[PDB]
């Protein structure tokens, strides 16, 4: 009988690599439905901060109004979640908008002529000709502004090219940003590409010694197949550096003495972050939000 | 968000059409996975659509004028102090002209004119089922030597046209198709790398449509999307000796993907690998 | 028109890798292959974003009806 | 000798400033040749 302690004595983790932007770890003998539930809940359910409403004042720029509001919405922010809780939508906006629900970032840029010796880059022809993401000045307001005194609201990338300006054109606006889940609008998704893959298993049916392994090793990445000498038949170094391409199936020499399979139990996960999350805490919240989705039904009787 | 074709004709650069991009490039996955396509109809990714996947705008121009004629001027723009209803400042100024960048529905004031004969200011509203944005207003007064007074203003509207479900996207090979459903990336099948295809085409169209170019540019565009090169189409350069599936196949072989182009995919709903590999590539 | 951000297929931010890409082509005189690999774009979904962008905004701005030519 | 490829550092150069010399792309100008050439010859040529 399958039990939790019988699955716990077999379940293991193997973190292959880790970084402040991307982490790649391995899960041993876990079910595909549970692994797919983790990936599916990581790409959709994890909350994030993003611009939700736009209040424009002057958009004389050549870039259209709704397009600028579209790009400002897509601009990611390095704002840690769980500081601003969820906001209701049924009540009117005049009291729905509080400092605890949303935080506001402003933008006020004007372009003027700058004389210089003339094909020439616009960096020395005008003033503030290109408005980057760093120009989005967060506005500390409301009841609690000390919560951001440690780390200010900074966009995830200050080099994002939002718009370009010309003399006589101005940009004045205030932007309200709230939290949201990726299912409503995928701009709230802090993950770049949440995906997993099965470890490609390779079976050796016949001896590969001789010049056969000299051409067999190059069909795969060099780090996959290892050779010792003319004897001691070649083996595999590690099946994790092997990208599944089925290159050996084209040759009739290897089409009979090798088989490419899949380990239905060993998964590897490689997750990225947009800037508001970390690849470790977002998986910690992944198992937590799934632990919350089903516990919400555990302590809940049935109706009818 | 128009882009140039990865695989383009040799004369596409000679014509200077790079100045006018007419389409974009995205990852095509020829699958029947979803099940909402029993024809050449396609399915876009909802996560790609919310990022600007094929974003377009419309521009209308209406010339509103009050001049019927040598005759004395009767209608006058602006406002007369005789009588006035309220709630007309949110759309117009004090001169009877609308502000720039205001959202107008059908039944909203767009330009108000006063008339001295009927001693009553009446509004002529914009009537169109699609509510648009106000972009430009042009003041023109002419056909007169020394007497000037405006009786013709050219208002210009812009229509935010987000690509909804129901529009007609198509490739450049006659592959007609209407958007069946905006499939979200939550249940979209993900490849070995982790990219979700923003378009799905039913493979059952090819036997009747009789098209192979969109296949060969799905490998050419895939090779170019890795090596950075831009393959040139320039038809009548390939023959039975060197087939394009082989010439473009060796580039995928030395790139790290499959020689034929069949990339191993993973299903979205259950999560296990599909039976066979999925044909993946990019098409303009 | 303007350089896109949050590539449709993958989702990685790309709008911040356009001017730095033009610098890698003009200054270092590199090829399109290495100039794309240096910016940190491994997947061909986000690679083709700025590898093929036209950036018509540099030509739309030449029409400024608010100041003398 | 890569292929018949495109270019960005050279196309964006045209987007910065149009050439003060003759019009670039000397192939699209021949597309209106039957139109502008016919109306040109209406006044151009000997005897008006």
């Amino acid at each position: 009988e399958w039990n939790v302690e019988k699955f716990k004595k077999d379940f293991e983790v193997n973190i292959s690599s880790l970084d402040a932007r991307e982490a790649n770890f391995d899960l041993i003998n876990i079910d595909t439905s549970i692994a797919n539930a983790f990936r599916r809940i990581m790409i959709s359910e994890v909350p994030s901060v993003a611009a939700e409403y736009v209040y424009f004042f002057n958009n004389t720029s050549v870039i259209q109004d709704e397009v600028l509001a579209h790009r400002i919405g897509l601009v990611p922010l390095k704002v840690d979640p769980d500081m601003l809780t969820w906001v209701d939508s049924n009540l009117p906006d005049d009291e729905k908008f509080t400092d605890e629900n949303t935080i506001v970032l402003s933008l006020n840029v004007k372009c003027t002529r700058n004389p210089d010796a003339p094909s020439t880059d616009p960096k020395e022809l005008y003033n503030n000709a290109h408005v980057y993401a760093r120009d989005l000045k967060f506005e500390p307001q409301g009841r609690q502004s000390t919560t951001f005194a440690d780390c200010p609201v900074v966009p995830a990338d200050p080099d994002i090219l939002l718009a370009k300006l010309r003399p006589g054109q101005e940009i004045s606006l205030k932007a309200h940003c709230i939290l949201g889940i990726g299912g409503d609008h995928a701009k709230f998704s802090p993950v770049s590409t949440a995906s997993y893959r099965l470890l490609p298993q390779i079976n050796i049916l016949q001896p590969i010694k001789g010049e056969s392994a000299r051409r067999f090793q190059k069909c795969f990445p060099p780090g996959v197949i290892g050779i010792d000498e003319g004897s001691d038949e070649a083996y595999v170094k590690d099946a994790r550096k092997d990208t599944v391409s089925r290159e050996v199936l084209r040759y009739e020499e290897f089409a009979d003495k090798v088989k490419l399979g899949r380990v239905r139990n060993h998964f590897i996960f490689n997750v990225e972050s947009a800037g508001a999350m970390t690849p470790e805490e977002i998986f910690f919240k992944s198992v937590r939000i799934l632990k919350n989705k089903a516990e919400y039904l555990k302590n809940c009787p049935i109706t009818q | 968000t128009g882009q140039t074709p990865i695989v383009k004709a040799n004369l596409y650069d000679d014509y200077g059409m790079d100045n006018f991009p007419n389409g974009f490039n995205a990852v095509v996955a020829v699958i029947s996975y979803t099940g909402y396509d029993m024809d050449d109809a396609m399915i876009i990714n909802k996560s790609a659509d919310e990022r600007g996947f094929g974003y377009g705008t419309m521009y209308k121009t209406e010339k509103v004028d009050l001049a019927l004629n040598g005759d004395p001027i009767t209608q006058h723009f602006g406002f007369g102090n005789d009588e006035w209803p309220k709630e007309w400042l949110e759309k117009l100024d004090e001169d009877g002209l609308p502000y720039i960048g205001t959202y107008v529905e059908e039944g909203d004031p767009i330009c108000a004119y006063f008339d001295d004969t009927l001693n009553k200011t009446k509004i002529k509203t914009y009537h169109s089922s699609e509510p648009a944005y106000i972009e430009e207003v042009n003041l023109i007064g002419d056909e007169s030597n020394k007497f000037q007074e405006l009786q013709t203003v050219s208002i210009k509207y812009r229509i935010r046209r987000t690509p909804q479900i129901g529009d007609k996207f198509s490739s450049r090979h006659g592959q007609k198709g209407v958007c069946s459903r905006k499939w979200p990336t939550i249940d979209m099948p993900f490849s070995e790398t982790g990219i979700q295809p923003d378009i799905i085409i039913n493979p059952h169209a090819f036997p009747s449509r009789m098209t192979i170019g969109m296949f060969v540019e799905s490998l050419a565009g895939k090779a170019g999307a890795l090596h950075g090169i831009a393959q040139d189409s320039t038809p009548w350069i390939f023959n039975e000796d060197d087939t394009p599936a082989d010439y473009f196949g060796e580039q995928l072989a030395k790139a790290g993907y499959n020689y034929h182009g069949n990339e191993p995919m993973y299903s979205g709903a259950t999560g296990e690998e599909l039976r066979a590999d999925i044909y993946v590539g990019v098409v303009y | 028109m303007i350089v896109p951000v949050r590539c449709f297929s993958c989702g990685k931010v790309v709008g911040d890798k356009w001017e730095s890409y033009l610098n890698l082509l003009q200054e270092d005189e590199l090829d399109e292959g290495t100039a794309l690999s240096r910016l940190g774009l491994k997947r061909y979904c986000c690679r083709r974003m700025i590898l093929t962008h036209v950036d018509l905004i540099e030509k739309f701005l030449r029409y400024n009806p608010l100041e003398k030519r | 000798a890569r292929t018949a490829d495109f270019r960005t550092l050279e196309r964006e150069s045209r987007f910065i400033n149009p050439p003060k010399d003759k019009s670039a792309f000397p192939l699209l100008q021949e597309a209106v040749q039957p139109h502008i050439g016919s109306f040109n010859a209406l006044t151009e040529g000997p005897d008006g």
Binding site: S16, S17, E22, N24, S195, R197, P221, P222, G223, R240, K241, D242, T243, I268, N270 | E192, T193, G194, L226, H227, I229, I237, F238, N239, D241, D242, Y247, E250, Q251, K254, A255, G256, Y257 | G33, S37, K42, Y44 | A1, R2, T3
Partner: peptide, 24 residues
Amino acid sequence: RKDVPKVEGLKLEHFATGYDAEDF
């Protein structure tokens, strides 16, 4: 007829999801 000029100087520009161009 001369064959189509093959693009020269190409390497492996793709690897596993968590492995970079570390293998020569």
